[PDB]
Amino acid sequence: RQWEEARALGRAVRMLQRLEEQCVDPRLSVSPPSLRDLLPRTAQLLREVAHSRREAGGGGPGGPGGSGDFLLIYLANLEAKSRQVAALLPPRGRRSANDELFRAGSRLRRQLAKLAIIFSHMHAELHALFPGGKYCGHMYQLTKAPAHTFWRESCGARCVLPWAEFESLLGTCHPVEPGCTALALRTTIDLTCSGHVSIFEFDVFTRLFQPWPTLLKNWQLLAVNHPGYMAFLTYDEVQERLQACRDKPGSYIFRPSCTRLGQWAIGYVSSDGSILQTIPANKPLSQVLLEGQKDGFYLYPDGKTHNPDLTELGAENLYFQ
């Protein structure tokens, strides 16, 4: 067994090249995430992976959760996702279509941004686990130590896990309420919508919802139950959303940055009525919103009046840091 993976990688690369052709419409995109930057970016990185592994004693061990297993799943998913984009914006292209695909607020536009985000996340994961094509998943270090401790004691050297096993493991540390809560969490953690959670995906989430002792609490209070939290939005979408709230200076919404993974992008309307977006480093989100509230910048989630009191959570988070 030497050539299956190579064929897989080649199949993917060709498909990315073919999909790049279908993204012929000018209105794409071009602000990050842009499928048009991402596709050839991801293609070349795949070539490097292909090439780095012709000549490989590596990387790492090769049971489930190793590099070979990771790629099997990763490529399968990339292909799946590519088909969805194929179906959305055919054909070669042909003319200039579809007009709805680029109306702010439209459904297709959202379907497209969500796919564009998935591609950004798919590339980010590969770049993190195979920098320059060279696998480091057996050595990768999570940013928050307690997260790191967890991942290595639970998962060992593995870089990737099926959702079910991951949930079970996370559960024995922070209990995950079954049903709609467990589903919401899965949707938040599984950035690639692959059915598996990578050491990278986990790095993103544990950074976003630090500190560790309140991991799920933060996710629950600041994402699931906060009206200012906007799951999986692009920058341009934020700009579009807040257009209505330009009346109410102090209106704000937040989401994960797409280009600085692990970090938040707060979007607020200024005094002037200008829509500004800022990425804070590197505080918990509870600290970020409290200070922005206390300074008059972050007052009205989604342009609405009910701003959850986070006083206790913020205090709790400083205590645990």
């Binding site: 920058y235 800022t278 922005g292 910048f297």
Partner: peptide
């Protein structure tokens, strides 16, 4: 314009 403005909390 620049994309991501300065943190307004300092």
């Amino acid at each position: 314009l620049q994309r991501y403005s300065s943190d307004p909390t300092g």
